Structure formats: C-alpha cells, structure tokens
Design brief:
part of a larger assembly, 8 chains, A: about 240 residues, mainly beta, Protocatechuate 3,4-Dioxygenase, subunit A, nine-stranded mixed beta sheet, two-stranded antiparallel ribbon, 14 strands, about 5% helix, B: about 200 residues, eight-stranded mixed beta sheet, two-stranded parallel ribbon, 4 helices, 13 strands, globular, binds fe (iii) ion, Protocatechuate 3,4-dioxygenase alpha chain (chains B, E, F, H), iron (chains B, E, F, H), oxidoreductase (chains B, E, F, H), Intradiol_dOase_core (chains B, E, F, H), EC 1.13.11.3 (chains B, E, F, H)
Chain lengths: ~240, ~200, ~240, ~240, ~200, ~200, ~240, ~200
C-alpha cells in the first residue's frame, strides 16, 4: 500500500470564513478566496507525541485540578471513536479538550461572567486515541455561556476539542454539544455550518447503557477526519 | 463514506486547553510550547516572530498559532515521510504559541528548515507551514513562511509559483534581521484587507 | 407593428456577479450595483452577419479540422430552436460554439491537462439560425475537464455557446450540459445559478428518435433570448 | 470448517435464455429446460493462475497498448470488491475486462463502425483480486456502441468483465455501466434482466472522493459471486 | 412566457470559439476581428485601446471584448435602426478582440461615431457600447465609452446624467491622445475597487 | 445476504478480452490458450474438437469455449480438491479457445482425464466440464463431454443417469477417432432444436 | 430540406407477433426475429391515389349502399387528424375503413352470426386526408361482435382502418374503439398491445360540441404515423 | 413527440374494406385491384403468384397482400423518389389482392421492375416489396421478392447480403416459369416453421 494525497476538504461541509451573524468573523475573515494547492510531503506529514509524557489524570477533568475536594457539577464520561472519511481508525491521534465549569465560567483571565468559579475545576484535558481510534475522558458538564455577539447571546453547553493526527491536512478544531440542549437551535456559531446534517454531526448522544450507577452519566461522540487515498499507478507525491 | 466533522472557531479562550500555562493553569507535568530547539538539535537556530492583524489593522491578542516543519536536512519527523533518510532524532518539528495579551507579538525558537522534495521530482524552497486559530476564525487558516535570503530557491518553488498574482507571493516571505548575534525572521500576518496574507486550502 | 424596448432582464434568473464558490469571480465582480438604464437605439440594434461568408463545414466540428483522419470520440448531433421570451423565433442569429475534445483537453495554449490532444479535432464552430429559429451542428462529445477552483474540481462535459441576435440587449454567452452527467450536481459554476429550474434549462436532452443509425446520437437543446415588447401608444424610444 | 456445495443459482435473478427483444438469442437459446444437478468435486473446483505471469501494465488500459502517445478519451479508474453471496471476500480471482475505445469502436476484425480507431488503445486488461477481494484498473471511458438488433439500437457505454474464482460453479461473464448514462433505460440487453434491482446491480457509481486531481475520475463497482455453504453433519460431496 | 436562458462564464478559453486565430486554430476562411474600418468606410479613423484590471489591480490576460457602435452620421448598420437615414454601406459597426496574453493590452481600429438620437427627442453624445467576457465573470459586463473631446455633448447626455454619482461619470470617458498622426483614445476598465468602471444593466 | 451479480452476454467481440491474439492484439506477454499439455504432463494426449450450431444448423463463428478437467489420476489442480492425493504438477486443468472465424471449428489439446469421485461414495465416469459464451447467449451454457470408449463407466455415471430421457444422454458422448497416430474426440454442440445438447444448471 | 429515413418503428409500442391469448396468432406468427434493414428508396416511397377517382359518397357509410331506405342504427360522424410522430400533418393519405353493421354483423360470406343483416348498409368507405391532415366520414355505430377465440369472446364495437401515406414504411392497419365501451377491458386482441397508454391511443373520444342536433353524434380520433428525419450532413439514402 | 398508433390485426373480413368486390359489395365506381399493367405501361409483363402457409403447412384463405415496386427503369411513381429521372406515366406501382377462398392462391399482373439505387452508391437487384395482412397477424409482415434469373444482381444486393444465414436468402427468390407464352414467377410464403420466409422490420 502506497499512500497518495488526502481527499480534498469539502468546503460545503464547513462554515464559510465570513459569517455576519457571528460578528467577530466580519473583520477576521480573508477577503480573497483560499488558494488550493496539490499536496506535498509537508501536508501529509504531522508530528508524533509520546504516551510516556502524559500524566495519569490528563483525561480526568474531575480530578486533574482538584485540590481540597471534588468540583461541583454533573459527573459525565465522554467517549467515542476517531476515524477518517473512509472509515479507517485514526490511531494515536492527540486529542485536546477545554471547557467552562458548571456555572458556565472559564478559568481564563479575560472571563468576567458572574457565574461562580470552582476552585477544584481546571477545564482542560488531553489523551491519545488507541489502536481502534477510541478515546475516553471524564469531566463536569459545562454550563451554557452568555457572551456579547448580540447583547443576550448564549452558547449552548459545549466542549472545545482539537485533533493533531497523521497528516497536517487533517488538523482540526471544533466543539461538540449535548443532546437535547435547547440553545443548540439558536446559536449563531453553530449556524455558521450550512447544512443541518453537519450541525447534527456535532451533537454528543446520551449513552444510557454506559452510565455508571450512582456515579456518572455518559455521552457518545465520534469524530471524522480527512482520509488519505491509496495510489496504484503513478506516484507524484514526490 | 463519512463527511469530515465540521470546523468551529477555537473561541477566545483557546488557551485554556491548548496552552494552560498562558492561562495560569498547572495541570500537566509536561507542557507543549513554542520552543522546537533541544540541546542536541542540529541546524541554525532562528527566531520567528510577528503579529497577526485584523481588517482594521489591529493586532489579535487572542490568537493561537502552530507551525510544522522539516529538520535541517529537509526531512519531517513523521512516519509519513517517505524519503528513506534519517531525521534529526532530537526534533519534534512542531510548536504552538499564543500572542502576548498586551502587545500581540508571538514568537517561536526553532531551526531553519532544509529543502523538502516537491511533487514530480521538483524541490520546494525552505518553508515552515503555519496555522492560525482565534475567536472569529471559523476554520484554522493555513499559510507558509518562506525566507527572504532564499531568493534563488523561492524563485523555483512550485507552490509560490502556483500563485498567479506575483504581488501576493511577497506576503509569504519573512524578513531576516540580526538582533545581537541572533537571527530573527519577522513575519506579520494580515488576515484581511490591503496586503492580505495568502491563505491556502491544503 | 412598432417595436418598443426589450423586457427587463430578470436578474433572479441569472447567476449573481459575486459567487464565492467560483473563486475567480471574487476579484472579477463589481462592488457597485449595476446601473439600469432605459433603452435607446443603441441597445435595441445589433450587427448583421452574412451567410455568404460561412464555410460549408463551419457547423461540422467532426470534419472542419480533420487532416489525416476523423477525430476520436462520440459522434453527436446537437440541434434545437432559438426563440425570444414571448416565443417568437429568432431568425438569422449568429451562434458560435467551442469545447474541449474527447479527453477533456482544449486546443488552447494555456491548457496543460494530461488528457490527450486529438490532431484531428479543433473544437469550434458557428452557424446562423434559420427562419424558424432552428440550428444544427455535429461534434464529438467533450470529456469532463479538471480545473483548479478547489484542487479536485471537475467540469461536467459541456459546450460553450454565444449568441448575437437582433438587439445588443439580447447578447448572451452560456454553456449547456448533457442529460444524465453526474458532475452536473457538483459543479460550482452551474451552482452560481440560483434556481433549480434555471439550472435545468441548460441541460441538453437525449433525442433518441433523431439518432442516425450506425452513425451518430442526437441531443435537443433550445435557447431563449430576451424579447421585445410592441408599442401601441406613445413611442418614446426616439 | 468443511465446505459443502455452492448455494443454488437463483434463476430469477438472471436473464432467461430466450429473450426475443435481443434478437440473436432467438436461435441461440436451448428449447429444453436446463438440467439441475447436485454438485461434485467437478463443480466446486477451479484453476489457479499465478501472479508471476502478469505484466506490470496488465490492469492499465491507458498504457498497455500505447505506442506513440496516450489514447484519446476520458481517463477513469475503476475499483471495487468481489465477494461471495454470504459476504466473504473472493481472493485471487482472475478478473478480465474488454471494451470499445472512446469512439465506441472495438479493435476487432468484425467491427466496421465509423467511430474512429485509436492507434494507442487496445481495450483489454486483467488483474487478480487481492486478499480483501479488492481490484483496481485504469482505462479510457468507452463510447456507446450502435449495433444491429432493431436498426437504430445503441449500447450504453459499457465494460465487459469475466471472473474465474474458486469454484467452476461461480464462473461468470457480465457487463457494467456508468451512473447516469441515459441509454441504460433503453437497452434490450440490460432489459433481459427481469428485476429492476438486479439491473441496478450492474451500474458503477461515481466515486468523487477518489478522483485524482488534474488526472482521472473514479467509479466504484462491486461484484457478488455464488457462495459455498459449510457442512456440519454428513458430508456427501464425496 | 419563457425565461431567458441563464448566463454562464465564458471561461478561460473563450478564444477557441470566439477568436480561433488567437488560439492558433485555422478553421474558418473568413474570421471576425477588431478592425471595423474597411477601405471605403467614412469618418475619422481612431484607435481605441486599454487594459482591463481585476480587484488587485492586475490586468486580465484572458479577457474578450466586443464593441457595437453607429457610423459617422450616428446611424446603426442594423435593420432595427428606425431613423430612415442611409447607413454607411461599408461598415459592420461591430468588432471583437482579446487582450494580449503577455501584456493585457486590447485594441480596436474603428471610426469615431456620430451622435445618435436618445429617448423622447433627446440626443446622445457619441459613444461606443462595450461588453466584457472572461473566466470569473458570470454575465457579460456592459459599459459605454464616451470621448473627452466631446465635453459639450457629454454634459447633455441622458445616460451619463442618469448616473447620480457625478464622480463615477468620469470612469466612462476615454482620453484622446495623438501617437504619430494617429488619434488614439485610451480607455482602461477597472472591474472592482477604487475608480471601478460604471457597468450597466441594459 | 447478497444476490449474485446478474449475467450478461459476452457479446460478439468476446475475443478482445478473452483471447487478444485471435483479435490480433499483443498486450500480454503470457497468454491463456487451448493447450493444456505441457512437456512433462502425464497421461494420454487427445485432441478434442467440434463445432457449435444454432437453431438453423449453422455454426457459430463467434463462440468462446472453456473446459475444466482433472489430471490423469482423476485429481483437480485446485486447492478445493479434497482427495488428499497429489495432482500432476505440470497441469493447469483449464483452457480457452474460440471457433475459427471462417469454419467454426474449435479444438483443445489436452489429456484424457482419470475418473473422479462422485457424491456419496460413487465414481463418476471420465469427463471434461465445458462452458460456452457468445453473442445471443445471456448466461454461459454448461455441459459435459464423456467418451464413447468408456462405455462401462458411462453406464454407471451418476450425472448421466440422472438425465431421465435416455436418448438425451447420448448428446454428451464424444466419438473417438484416430487421425494419423493422434486420438481425436469429436464433440459437436447443438444449442437448439433436434438433438439439442443437454445443458446443466450446476 | 433533404429528407433522410423514417425513424425506427418502436417495437415496444406495438403488439408482438406471437400472442397466445389471440389463438389464431399461434400458427401465424414467425418463429424467427424480424430482420431490420437500413432504408432505401423502396421503403421511403409510396403510391399516389387521385382524388378524381373517388365517388361523392365514398366517405358516407350511411348512404353509399342505401337502396330502399336508410340503414338502422346510431348515426355517428367520426373525424380527426393524421400526423407523423414529429407532429407534421400527413397530406393526401388514403384512409380506408370497414366494419360490421348495427347488429354486429359483417356483410361477408364467412359471417354466420345471427345478428340481423341490414339491406341498406355496406360497411366500407374511404377518403383522402386534406392539407391539414384532417379526415371525416359518417357511419352507423357497429355493434359488438361475438367470435370464436375462447367460446364466449366478444369484440368491443370497433371500426377497422388502413392508411397508405407518403412512405411504404408508414403502412399501417389498425382498429379504433368507442369511449366507454366496457368490452374494451376484456378484449384479447386489444390486450396484445403491451402498454396501457398505447391501448388508449385507439379509443375515439365523444366530441359533444360537434354533435349535429336531431341528427348525428360525433367521435374524435387522431392517428399518428412514423415520421421522416431531415438530413443535414451526409446523405446516404442514395 | 408522439408515439405511432399501435397496429391491430386486419381480422378475417379484411376484404369488406380493402377489396369490396371480393366480398360482393358494389359501393365504389373505381376499385383498387391486382392489375398494375395499363395498356401503355412499359416493360415486360409478368405474373406473380403463390400461396401463404401457416405453421401446419395449410394455406391462408383469408390473407390480403399488397405489393409496391418501381417501373421498368427502376424509378418509383412517388414524389419521394429523388432520382431526377422520369417515371413511366402509366404505372401506379402498387396493387392489392386476396387469396382465393377455396384454394388460397393469390396473384398479381405487373411488370418486372428495373434495378433501383441502394444506399451509399450501391445498386439493389430488381425486387418487389410485399406486405401481408390477415386474421392472426398483429402487424403487417414485410418481405421482398427477388427473381431467380437475376443471379448476378442478387449476389450483389445489399439487403440480401445483410441476411447472415445464407440459407435464408433463398426464401426471398421467386422461381421463373413459362406458362404458354406468359412469364410467371412462383413465390410461396411460409409464415412459420421450416423454410420460414424472411420478414423485415423496415
Ligand atoms: Fe466556549
Ligand atoms: Fe469549458
Ligand atoms: Fe460490448
Ligand atoms: Fe372486426
């Protein structure tokens, strides 16, 4: 098996750069169209991170910052699989997540929301996918976050995530939401995605058989990255 | 076949998760950062720095930047590199940084990359691949940094020559400077407007 | 019968100038709105071309450039009628066409596609409509053409056409496609047209009863131009 | 695992021998019903062909007969999987294909069609399926072929294929077509197949994510052969 | 009633079919071109030339331009002209040209048109109607060329006066020059941006 | 569960792909053919020949035929043979041929097969399995060739005895002849009509 | 305008030759498929009949055989247009009709039905279509006719017609029926036509506005013949 | 586009309307018949006769036959003939007849036709086009009659040579006989079975 380039990104499956309803994008979106290039070794390669450097609680947002006690909020486990567009598992990909606490408050200098800070919650974690492309982390469900777009804008509860996998072309940052949240229908940020089926691809599903009795609930969320094509005739990559 | 998970902005607090130290959060023993030079790393040390400007010419103070590049001999520290040559064993090839909250300046300490093969027998001029994430940016913006002292190589670069507007190619060339013994390349990014930096769909 | 002005162009039946999905339009589209003017003799008049100056094979793309043999590819006849919006035939209009060869390769200096060139195919023809507004030409069906918009963009098979008819206001250049081509659904250029019914107005239909046995297939394609209104009261044109 | 006989061929999933609309079948179809027999070693065995005897371009119809240049026509890659009716991959099966050129002309003594011959195209290839039952070949899309059944009969574009796999009972020759071709609806040969779902099983699907930019398009086509049952009680085969 | 067939871009190879000679294709004995002057044509010979610029100020080297105009006495060589006056019999009134692939300059050899009646008894100043087609242009762009030496006529022109932005009217006025005995009118077209040429829906 | 891909005729040019040499096409270095005898092949050499006739009694000159058979000891050169005996290592067991375009005669050079076990302890008489493809034939037609000099074996063959019309069994028996030292078995196939060859659904 | 061949007859729009439900066809249908040929002058030409030789009552079946009085039965006028498949009128075509009388009795030696004979009815007429392809005749509505196919078979009321027009290839004989007749649904002869829409093409429609008060009812029935294609390139006919 | 009106059998009484005299009906003054020879008609007089047989070999006594042919010089008395030659003015070129109710014999009195141009410069051998209608025949059956004394012409006829079964061509050749000074061509038609007459889709 000789690998060729990643399949082209389907721009219609993603938000456009200029999206007037999300006001900050107006001045931070290029006026010129992106220039598409044919891929080289630069685009199909990516770094490797070693499992040895990860701490034991790096995927446990409930405990990795707990000092005097446990954080306040809903205990939830999130898991799923990362695969490429042709369905192949993405192994040893670096998954990083960040979020607000149960009050909808971020532990960030620039967040002045009145929702209370939790001295026992940090809000960031990371993990590597396994050989099946599986990942799992535990956290506190974040509360919805009010922000200034229109004056009374509110983000649905959400968790930010980032993936660095096999090729630089697969680099991706996004956010997932929780099944049933009514703010999902009103969010200008989620509405920058043009199609309904794609907005639904960011909603984590309640996974009731995987709840742990008298302990935690569970959400299932899978992620799809760009996939590489195989070459059977000329190999122009190099 | 499946569709790619759709991109969403990194938002204004992209530091909590990608650079917890800049947010004053100590959860990890080993942290990722903007220093790609280890003590035994081969090659010439350079500092890459600049600012990112919005359409009114103001610097973004909440931007997150990552770079990806080859070692001194033009080999990527990736299993996907098929050159059959040994890569510098003390080189990750990647780093991440955030702009300073007050000034907007960002920087990386790295090595000047060697030339990497291009498609169909061509040779690419030395370059670093760069991606930008921020509140207001719906999909990470990809660009490349070339070096002004590599004039002959740049003239023959496949990607630079594929940009038809000759005047836009110059937005991808960093300027070499020499601050007290150190080699610094200045690369400012203009997201929108006059002299807008070329961004690529890769 | 005293003729007045052409009916207004219905801008909603045409692509807009700025269409981000077709990247080249981003810098080649005016920022200002078009200025509509009331028509004068300048807009309702147009040149006349004489039938005497047309060669015998000008509408025969299979033979008008053949040197050593016939071009390679699917032999097809295309015919139809040109009428104005009120259904009146457009007589003696100049119809010009151009296209790629069977490989999807254009005989143009700037085309570097690897699809093979055909030494016996030129790719351009012209004809005048008759008194019923009828036209007919013969050609080789063109192959789909890969181009750089997104990196893996492909045009459906298509033939470019241009009409110069009775009034300068009717001046029109467009492209038609072939029934059934699956790339029709993915083309960013065809998608600049806002409505579905208008995208369908550019698809030539298979005309099976007009196939010529053991020789050529046939496609039917009609074209509609702007039509003039008649004046029955004041005549302000002049 | 002890194997028993192949499952019975479902005659209703195949064309009948006598099919008046395909005129040549009238005198070449048996009058007597076929005699069904219980299988023996003769029917469950088949030959083995060695990979060593295949040339490097045997599955590359674009280059395996090119002399002075490339053939004219649309560059397309066809790939898919061969499995048996129970879904198991068919490994190392011999797949042979043949077709007309871009003009709809066969390189065969008996073909007098006026569509032009291509000195750089042969029209035949072969390959062995791999361990996953996968096959891939590259070719020029064939043009539709006029023939004499009714006087103006036209075959849709098509590629003939043949499989010799694990058992003589699986021996099969058929033809596949290309998504969207309007002649598919009119072909008397495709209409000898009684059911609609089976006619659809012969249409190769456009596989857009597998197109190779500025190079070739791609069609996906899978094939299903008869499958063997396993024996768990008496073994009457021998 | 029927809807107009929708427009589509001419694409980058618009020359194959509209100017086969510029593409190096000899299929037609009689070819259409940019020379509207025949030996017996009446009127003063002028050369009309310029470039077409995109929004970054770069010339389009793949643009196709056609013009339509009246003869020296302001009569169109069209059956639709209702003035009842005889038109110059040696005048087609139309021409087509492409920009030079290297430089982007386009030109026509024609005659300076006479004034043509406007609506409701008015008189239009001398003008040539021009249309532009190119890759990226979804619908041919219509504009008009007036002449800077026809100041009094221009001041009374109905169409020019119907443009409310007085500053935009000037984009439609070509500048007269005199290159070695020949009268040349320079008319540059700016499709987008500062000093964008006025385009009309006719 | 999946349905079998439906059969379609091989069509009139079935030679392009299955016997490129008969079509005068040299694309393959190693070509498949009608000669199953290699120099070290064991067994008695025989020639199998005949014609295929349509319902009006005319020979098909566009027919393609393949045969499949066991070696001299009744063992198939197939991994699916479960007899536990070693097969002749210099025997493919399969061949393909086309009828002569002018005459319609087809032939194979092979070996007379040994008897193969039948179901439930029975023994099948020596036979070759044969399949026919042609324009007009929607699904390959399967039949078997037995030998007239194997009278005792034929009388006990399970498949032949499963044909109730005793008179039809004879259509499956080839006639032995001896042309100048060579053993030839003549087997004519009648697709339709009087003396129609028995065809099997296997 | 240079004419080429007639369009191919679409065999699926006509009854097959062998139709077991119409018993007489079993022994009068060829076993071999028809042989399609490319047309020559022989097939595109046909005779001309002169209007001068037609009598004044040739299209008046009510009076052309009346001796002592008028025939008994329902007075009906039948009219319509004859056109070719491309909609062009068929001018001066010879139309001949024949039918039974009001009792369902034919004036033919071989008809022994007990329905009464009418001494004032003959049952045959003819006319030439005019320049618009129009024809009109007057008759007595025929009664349904019992015949021996199955023992109790009954033909719906019907009128036989024959056309000899511009080309021998258009030669056609058929039968039309009357709107509403319940026997139309049971007739084995009408059911030899495979498609429903074609069976409906033989039903004459009640034309109430054209009834003549206190005199006759009226049925409208149009006929479509094969149409010739026009030639614009090579003319191989000769 | 419209579909052709579907064919239906002529039925058993096809004579009432097509040959009223054979049915004993006198409604028309001028009647169409089987005599194509007028007193001034040019060419050699011949009689064409035969019977039409069903699949059990019995003659149809209810069959209606029509023929269409060219004059003595191979020109059709039709406005659609494009040969530019004058046709015999005393020749209709068409006739109709019915078989005798008792015997089944049918006949025509006509002239032997001259050769007519074939497609692409070819020449067709002399022939008469014939169509049969009857109870049981759903669509009129088209065939052609060639002449056995025109052996060289028949060998070069395009239509006859397009019939691949050489043995079936003979069913289209009438046999010349000479009954007391008169030239008679016998042409029997076998609708079904052995020696079935070739029928064409024209
Ligand atoms: Fe957030
Ligand atoms: Fe194009
Ligand atoms: Fe074929
Ligand atoms: Fe009847």
């Amino acid at each position: 098996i000789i690998w060729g380039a990643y399949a082209q990104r389907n721009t219609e499956d993603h938000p456009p750069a200029y999206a007037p309803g999300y006001k900050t994008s107006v001045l931070r979106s290029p006026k010129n169209a992106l220039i598409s290039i044919a891929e080289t070794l630069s685009e199909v390669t990516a770094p490797h991170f070693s499992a040895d450097k990860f701490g034991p609680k790096d995927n446990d947002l409930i405990l990795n910052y707990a000092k005097d006690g446990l954080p306040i909020g809903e205990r939830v486990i999130v898991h799923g699989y990362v695969r490429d567009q042709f369905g192949r598992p993405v192994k040893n990909a670096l998954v990083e997540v960040w979020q607000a606490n149960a009050s909808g408050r971020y532990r960030h200098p620039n967040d002045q929301y009145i929702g209370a800070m939790d001295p026992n919650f940090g809000g960031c974690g990371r993990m590597l996918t396994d050989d099946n492309g599986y990942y799992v982390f535990r956290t506190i469900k974040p509360g919805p976050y009010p922000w200034r777009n229109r004056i009374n804008e509110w983000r649905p509860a959400h968790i930010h995530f980032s993936l660095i996998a096999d090729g630089w072309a697969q680099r991706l940052i996004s956010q997932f939401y929780f099944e049933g949240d009514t703010l999902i229908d009103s969010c200008p940020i989620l509405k920058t995605i043009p199609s309904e089926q794609q907005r639904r691809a960011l909603i984590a599903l309640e996974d009731k058989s995987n709840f742990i009795e008298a302990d935690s609930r569970c959400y299932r969320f899978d992620i799809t990255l760009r996939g590489r094509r195989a070459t059977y005739f000329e190999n122009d990559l190099t | 076949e499946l569709k790619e998970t759709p991109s969403q902005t990194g938002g204004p607090y992209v530091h909590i998760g990608l650079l917890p130290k800049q947010a004053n959060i100590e959860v990890f023993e080993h942290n990722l950062d903007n220093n790609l030079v280890q003590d035994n790393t081969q090659g010439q040390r350079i500092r890459l720095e600049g600012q990112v400007f919005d359409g009114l010419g103001l610097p973004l103070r909440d931007v997150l930047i990552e770079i990806w590049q080859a070692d001194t001999n033009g080999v990527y520290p990736s299993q996907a590199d098929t050159q059959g040559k040994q890569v510098d064993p003390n080189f990750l090839g990647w780093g991440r940084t955030g702009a300073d909250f007050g000034t907007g300046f960002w920087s990386f300490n790295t090595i000047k990359p060697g030339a990497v093969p291009g498609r169909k027998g061509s040779t690419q001029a030395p370059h670093i691949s760069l991606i930008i994430f921020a509140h207001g940016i719906n999909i990470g913006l990809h660009t490349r940094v070339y070096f002004d002292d590599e004039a002959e190589a740049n003239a023959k670069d496949p990607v630079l020559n594929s940009i038809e507007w000759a005047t836009r190619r110059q937005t991808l060339v960093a300027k070499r400077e020499e601050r007290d013994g150190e080699v610094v390349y200045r690369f400012d990014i203009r997201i929108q407007g006059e002299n807008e930096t070329v961004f690529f769909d890769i």
